Each structure stands twice: as structure tokens, then as C-alpha cells.
Amino acid sequence: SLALHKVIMVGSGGVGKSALTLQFMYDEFVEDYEPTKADSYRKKVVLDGEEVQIDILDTAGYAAIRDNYFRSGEGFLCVFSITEMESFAATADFREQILRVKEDENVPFLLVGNKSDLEDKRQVSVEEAKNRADQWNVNYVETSAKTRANVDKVFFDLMREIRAR
């Protein structure tokens, strides 16, 4: 059995949780994935010379069920869309939930600003997202599930944080 890294995708609706997951898993940009469907994925990848298994829980939004899922997670990709300010505002809600369940302010966590390809319709500045990440002591990365920009990066960077726990 190889090392297993459990990642959880969180964020408000339509930010790109599923598209990022499927782009990472199948190298395809899926634009119509059922908004209400939560699923898990698993695949073997090579992380810095070592073959490891990554498990990704793509959440879709009772309390006991959601808490158990967060407890099982080892790292979190907190996603928002750079084109929707409200989704950025919502990241504070997920941060609070994760800290409540994990009871660890150093839990592997990346703030992910998705849909970077839509610069034209950006509502969240790089400055404000970076500032929030700094205040939370986490790293910020902008991705595009459409062009694949930084998609592998966020998953691999998070795995390195899980490995370093």
C-alpha cells in the first residue's frame, strides 16, 4: 500500500470544484457536471519521485455527515471564482468550518482562485486574495479548469503540505 493523501474540495456553488477535480483526474474540461452531485475520486500519481495515491472528495454543499467528511480529509482546496465576489466572501465560512472540525490552524489548506482565464470579468483582485491568504497563513494560487493553468500545481502543492504535516 502506497501513501494515501485525502483531499477535500470546498467552496460555494459554481466556483469550479468539479471542473478542477475532473481536469486533474481525466485531463478534460467538463462544463455540465451535475451541480448537486458530490463524489470521490482516486488515482495514483508520482509526487517528487514517489508513487502515491490521491483521493479527492468533490463536495456539492445532516451536520454529522459533512463533519465526518471534513474529519476524514487531510488537506483542503478552498475554491472561489475570481469572477464572483460572493464566492470569495464565502471562503471565510468554509475556513471556519474546517478549523472547527480539524481544530488545527495549520491544516493543509490552499486558497484557490479559479476561472483565471476570465480575467475580463474578474471581481476579486489578486491583492485582496493574497492578503486574505497571508492573514490565514496559507498560500494562494489562481487556476483555470478550462485551460488547465495551475491545476496540477494546486493538487501537488497540497499533497506536499499533507506530507509535511
Ligand X SMILES: Nc1nc2c(ncn2[C@@H]2O[C@H](COP(=O)(O)OP(=O)(O)O)[C@@H](O)[C@H]2O)c(=O)[nH]1
Q: Which window, 15-23, 92-100, 116-124, 125-133, contacts Mg ion (CB under 5 A)? A: 15-23
Q: Is 125 helix (H, G, I), strand (E, B) or coil?
A: coil
Q: Which window, 12-20, 45-53, 64-72, 100-108, contacts Mg ion (CB under 5 A)? A: 12-20
The response to whether 14 counts as a known ligand-binding position is: yes
The response to whether 60 counts as a known ligand-binding position is: no
**Of residues 8, 10, 13, the one with CA closest to residue 84:** 13
Among 12, 18, 91, 116, which residue interacts with Mg ion (rule: CB under 5 A)? 18
- Alpha helices per DSSP H over 27-125: 63-72, 85-102
Q: List Cβ neighbours of 64 (8 Å cut-off, separation of 6 or more).
A: none
Burial of 26 (0-12, 13-18, 19+ CB in 10 A): exposed
CA distances, 125 to each of 46, 82, 130 (Å): 33, 8, 9
What mask, x for binding ligand X by CB under 6 A, covers residues 32 to 71? -x-x------------------------------------
**Of residues 84, 76, 58, the one with CA closest to residue 112:** 76
156/45 Cα distance (integer angstroms): 9
Q: Which window, 4-12, 13-21, 64-72, 141-149, contacts Mg ion (CB under 5 A)? A: 13-21
Least distance (Å) from Mg ion to the CB of residue 22? 9
Least distance (Å) from ligand X to the CB of residue 39? 10
What mask, x for binding ligand X by CB under 6 A, covers residues 117 to 146? xx-------------------------xxx
Q: Does 115 bind ligand X (CB under 6 A)?
A: yes
In the numeric block, which cell numbers belong to residue 110?
Answer: 490552499
Q: Which residue lies nearest Mg ion, judged by its C-beta?
A: 18
Among 7, 16, 56, 109, which residue interacts with ligand X (rule: CB under 6 A)? 16
Binding site as annotated, residues for GTP: 11-19, 114-117
